[PDB]
Amino acid sequence: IFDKQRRLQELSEKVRTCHQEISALRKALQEKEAEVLQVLEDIQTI
Amino acid sequence: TQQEIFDKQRRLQELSEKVRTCHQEISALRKALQEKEAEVLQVLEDIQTI
């Protein structure tokens, strides 16, 4: 049925939308982690 | 009690406080992820149903 396909497109586009959010959010996370890691490294470097 | 010791100490405290700015940001950014992730998981559950 076409209706099922249409409903899937609604949801499918929606999951594409969320993922891109998830991605950049995840990029933001790595950076903050990679940062505290740099701070710990600096603490030994004092 | 030397000045150099203190200077390092001040830097040390600065670094410890900085671990906070990171803890907070990490900790809240982590919530934002597990809500966005969860949201998408529910969509997936909807797609599974049809």
Place this chain on the structure above:
Amino acid sequence: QQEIFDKQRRLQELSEKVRTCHQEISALRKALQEKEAEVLQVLEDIQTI
């Protein structure tokens, strides 16, 4: 008709694959969080030192 069947088949298969991704994405995510939370405790215990 077969075109209709072919379509239904493909759709059923998709739901199954999506389910299996679901439970895996789900398990990974929970492994991450707990690991992610294990780090935080270490970080909070670093600030205490």
Place this chain on the structure above:
Amino acid sequence: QQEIFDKQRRLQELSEKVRTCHQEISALRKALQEKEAEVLQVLEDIQ
């Protein structure tokens, strides 16, 4: 006293533990993205 150095040795032990935890996380992230990517390509084909 100049026991700051001993605090530093202890800090080093804890930092090693988070560096190790972070090695896992990344590997877990790589798997999840692959899986997230997987389930995307599944949907893209459904039409």
